[PDB]
Structures are given as structure tokens and as C-alpha cells.
């Protein structure tokens with residue numbers, strides 16, 4: 001029955017009072033009074049059974065959201081669908097209702113250092129859990145970081161996530177890539193498929209920089225301009241870093257470029273806590289092997305008000321999914337994954 005700016009958003013007896021929020025990927029997002037728990041909640045409608053590619057992204061996100069339990073990762077409290085495969089056109093994911101996300105927040109609000117430190121702690125704490133499950137998010141950016149009115153931060157959108165696979169990370173120069181351009185590590189344009197953990201840390205660094213001045217630090221307009229932005233600020237890679245790149249074409253591209261030096265961080269962010277800049281530096285290290293890991297970051301001095309490893313939990317066990325089978329099998333699997341929420 002109930003409609004909300006057509007669409008049909010029928011989420012049954014339990015959830016009423018629908019109010020629009022935005023436009024997700026391949027569906028719509030509403031808030032809605034939950035008549036069993038007596039709170040407002042959020043509800044994403046997802047209609048992906050036509051295009052095979054949205055079905056992997058829905059299956060992935062569904063598997064992960066139900067396996068993970070963590071205060072800084074968005075949950076699935078409920079998942080609503082028809083009682084049969086045949087009748088299932090859409091899928092609805094009910095979550096906690098978060099006021100805003102960091103993208104929307106950074107357009108209008110400048111943040112205090114106390115807030116930056118706190119949000120960074122929460123991102124890194126949630127990322128620790130994710131990596132501990134051997135998973136990579138692959139698409140961390142401000143719009144994937146949800147916030148409520150009490151400053152609680154929750155990572156969302158695991159559509160692009162993958163199980164880590166460091167042994168199969170090498171690829172050729174200029175290999176096309178899916179994740180959001182601005183938060184892409186440099187090795188992705190050189191020689192990485194994005195199957196190692198240090199891909200997520202680069203993105204977190206990109207977010208710290210953005211939180212620090214309200215503006216993306218590497219806003220490249222297209223695939224290769226992303227790299228020139230990165231190099232504009234870090235300057236030319238050292239020879240040792242270039243020697244970790246064995247890939248000939250990527251290495252010669254880098255050698256062909258004129259020498260540029262490092263723009264120092266405090267020239268770029270003169271107001272910032274210099275401990276914040278120090279960690280920034282370590283997150284946005286050119287060489288992925290030297291870039292800081294998630295635990296080292298949590299233990300950096302910038303975060304010592306919050307750091308407490310025993311209150312920074314890890315997953316019960318590794319993750320293992322799948323990828324490439326067709327529309328129809330993926331529909332069966334999404335049906336199967338969501339059975340538990342039926343009566």
C-alpha cells in the first residue's frame with residue numbers, strides 16, 4: 001500500500017509513518033516508525049534482480065552486514081522481502097536511523113579538533129574489526145560514514161567489499177577500477193587490484209585530510225589526474241619506493257615525470273593539531289608496504305584519549321564468501337540469506 005514520492009514502499013504491518021530521506025543505489029531510502037520497538041528507523045529499498053551486477057553487490061553487503069556485529073558498523077536489524085522467490089521483486093534493509101552522513105555534514109559544518117579526533121577513532125576502530133575478519137571495505141569515503149545526533153559514527157556500504165588476497169594483488173599499469181576516485185590509493189593506478197588492507201588506510205587518510213579543511217585533498221577529474229594530484233602533494237617517489245614497483249610500465253611512467261617536492265602538511269593545514277598531521281603523513285605514505293596498519297594508527301599519540309585495545313574488538317573468525325555466477329542463482333542466494341527474518 002503506502003507510497004512515498006513515486007514509490008511503493010510496502011514494508012508491511014510492523015513499519016509505518018514513512019518519510020523520505022534520499023536516493024541510494026538502485027533504490028530509495030525512507031525513515032519509518034517501528035511499531036514493535038517503538039522507535040524511528042531507516043529502511044533502504046533495493047531492486048537489483050534485473051542487472052546481474054547489482055545482485056553481487058546486494059549479496060555481498062547482505063552476507064557482511066549479518067556476519068558483523070560492531071558499534072561502528074551499520075547493522076541489519078531486519079530484512080523484508082516476499083515469502084517466495086517468484087514474488088520477490090525488491091528487498092528492504094532495516095537499520096538504525098542515523099541523522100546524517102559525513103559528506104552532508106562537511107558541506108555546512110567546520111569541525112573542531114575534538115570532533116575530528118573522535119570521528120577518526122571511530123572509523124579506525126570499526127576498520128580494525130573489518131580487517132580482523134580478513135575483509136576490505138574498498139570504498140570508504142565521507143558518504144559511507146553515518147552519524148547520529150550523539151556523534152556515534154557507523155561505517156556502511158559493503159557493496160564493493162572483498163576478502164583480502166595479498167598474493168594476487170599485482171596487475172598491470174592503468175588497470176580500470178571501480179571504487180570512488182578521490183579516495184583511491186596511488187598503487188591502484190600503478191599496479192594494484194585493491195586486494196590488500198593498505199587500500200583502506202589510504203582512504204581513511206583522504207578522509208582525515210577532508211575533515212581537516214572541509215575539502216577533498218586529491219580531487220582528480222579523471223583516472224590519471226588522480227595520480228598527479230597525489231604526486232603534487234607527496235612529491236616524487238624516492239628510488240627505494242620506485243624499486244618496490246617492479247611493473248616496468250608503471251615505473252617508466254613515474255620516471256618520465258618532472259621532479260616535484262613534498263608540500264608540507266602544515267602548509268596545507270596550518271590550523272591542525274600537529275599530531276593529527278603526523279598520523280596523516282603515515283596514512284598517506286606512497287609505498288603501501290610502509291603505510292601504517294590499522295592497529296598502529298589506533299595506538300598513535302593523536303588518539304591516546306580513546307585508545308584502549310581491550311575495548312577495540314575483533315571478529316570471531318575470518319571471512320570467506322563466490323563472485324561469478326548469474327542473476328538467477330544470486331537471487332536464490334539473496335532469498336536464502338534473508339530467510340531468518342521471516343516468521
Ligand SMILES: Nc1ncnc2c1ncn2[C@@H]1O[C@H](COP(=O)(O)OP(=O)(O)NP(=O)(O)O)[C@@H](O)[C@H]1O
Pocket residue numbers: 021022023024025029042074095096097098099100101143144146156157159
Ligand atoms: N541508516 C541511515 N540513516 C539515515 N540515512 C541513511 C542511512 N543509510 C543510508 N542513508 C542514505 O545515504 C544516502 C547518501 O547517498 P548514497 O551515496 O546513495 O548512499 P546510500 O543511500 O547509503 N546507498 P550506496 O550508494 O549503496 O552507498 C542518503 O541519501 C541517505 O538516504
Ligand SMILES: [Mg+2]
Pocket residue numbers: 143
Ligand atoms: Mg556512494
